[PDB]
């Protein structure tokens with residue numbers, strides 16, 4: 331049977347080729363996860379079909395209905411066989427689907443407009459002239475809300491009450507806000523996206539400071555799926571063979587627009 | 591009517607260390623460190639009682655090419671001498687085939703250790719010169735990383751290292767570290783970032799980690815296939831990371847107990 335792969339349109343993971351209308355199936359798409367899917371399938375010996383997740387979401391469980399949405403939903407309810415996307419390995423997700431070991435490691439990080447005099451979370455926490463915030467929902471916001479660490483607690487206390495609101499509805503808005511606030515806003519987001527935007531025109535942002543924590547993206551399969559074992563082994567193999575780092579460098583830096 | 595969980599681990603600082611007064615103590619109380627604290631946390635979140643034991647042969651786990659027998663902590667798992675391994679054991683392909691690994695509790699990569707003063711700041715810096723010798727363990731994955739690499743800088747480094755005389759390779763990690771410290775600024779050692787970070791915080795505070803990591807791997811908790819502990823242990827690792835506990839333990843053992851300010 332043909333393996334149904336669910337994934338999501340997010341750059342540089344999966345992107346529509348400019349000439350996609352003249353192509354068909356897997357050839358329509360390009361990117362890090364398109365390249366990765368090809369490698370996984372090769373090392374697992376299966377045929378596959380990339381499908382873009384219907385609702386355009388990663389995967390969360392509705393607090394009321396208890397229904398999983400997004401790619402996780404597609405696995406849980408039996409609509410897809412495997413998800414290959416920048417899907418963070420989390421406890422609540424691990425409870426309902428299987429994850430490979432991480433194909434990418436990352437953490438919360440600081441994005442600034444070039445020239446902003448901030449180089450760390452501690453720097454942000456000790457001042458007020460430069461506003462800063464996170465997505466208005468999800469794990470990067472909860473990271474601060476729940477934190478017991480002095481610096482992060484100080485940041486949360488500021489962020490939760492800052493006016494005008496420092497939270498943004500989407501990642502794209504966070505990035506736009508940094509770019510359009512004249513140095514007066516810094517955005518807290520995934521280091522991977524931060525690194526990617528730094529290499530995109532108009533080349534006016536920078537990632538600064540260390541990552542504030544450590545998480546990973548994993549390939550996901552329905553709980554108890556027979557594909558899980560071989561997929562996990564393929565991920566470890568590709569990492570030991572340097573292929574994962576090669577794909578990251580290709581899509582983030584070789585294709586970078588901001589110089590060497 | 592019950593069975594106590596047997597944990598295998600390995601004496602490697604600061605993961606598991608003998609307390610100074612270990613002879614006055616008994617059982618699990620003899621030991622301290624990051625993985626000792628982690629063991630207690632895993633047991634609590636999985637509801638099991640346990641016994642810490644140090645791996646009999648003092649090794650991590652490798653499969654002999656000839657006899658096909660696993661040694662180390664992996665061997666203790668696959669041959670039924672221990673139930674779980676809680677140690678800085680790298681998640682690797684060959685190990686994952688025979689045992690189950692949790693998601694990583696620590697992530698890390700190859701890094702460069704210099705004696706303070708050495709004019710090297712990166713792998714690129716090393717590769718461009720020979721005045722400062724540099725090398726890796728004389729066996730294992732960190733050596734193999736360079737040998738198999740098709741990246742220009744790492745290829746150039748491998749070409750130098752493989753033929754360098756006197757040998758730039760070392761039999762143990764301890765020897766690499768001592769060689770950095772005792773080579774008067776003329777040796778740099780390539781090793782795990784975690785060990786590099788740790789040693790930088792030990793007296794005599796004469797070493798420094800430089801440059802970014804060259805790759806990314808993780809340490810995982812290991813259980814045999816079909817283990818009744820496997821699922822719960824993995825959920826516990828993810829939970830502990832989400833609750834900040836893993837970063838808290840790293841900070842405690844690396845920095846709060848550091849000696850170099």
Ligand SMILES: N[C@H](Cc1cccc(-c2cccc(O)c2)c1)C(=O)O
Pocket residue numbers: 388389416417418419420436437438468469470473520521543544545
């Ligand atoms: N990757 C997206 C967004 C997403 C979802 C859940 C967690 C995180 C995350 C990433 C790095 C550090 C951190 O503390 C949290 C990101 C997804 O999987 O929905």
Ligand SMILES: N[C@H](Cc1cccc(-c2cccc(O)c2)c1)C(=O)O
Pocket residue numbers: 650651678679680681682698699700730731732735782783805806807
């Ligand atoms: N942790 C020890 C030694 C050990 C074994 C296998 C791999 C690595 C390692 C760590 C970081 C980067 C890298 O490329 C390789 C370390 C063990 O598990 O035997």
Ligand SMILES: [Cl-]
Pocket residue numbers: 728729730
């Ligand atoms: Cl070897």
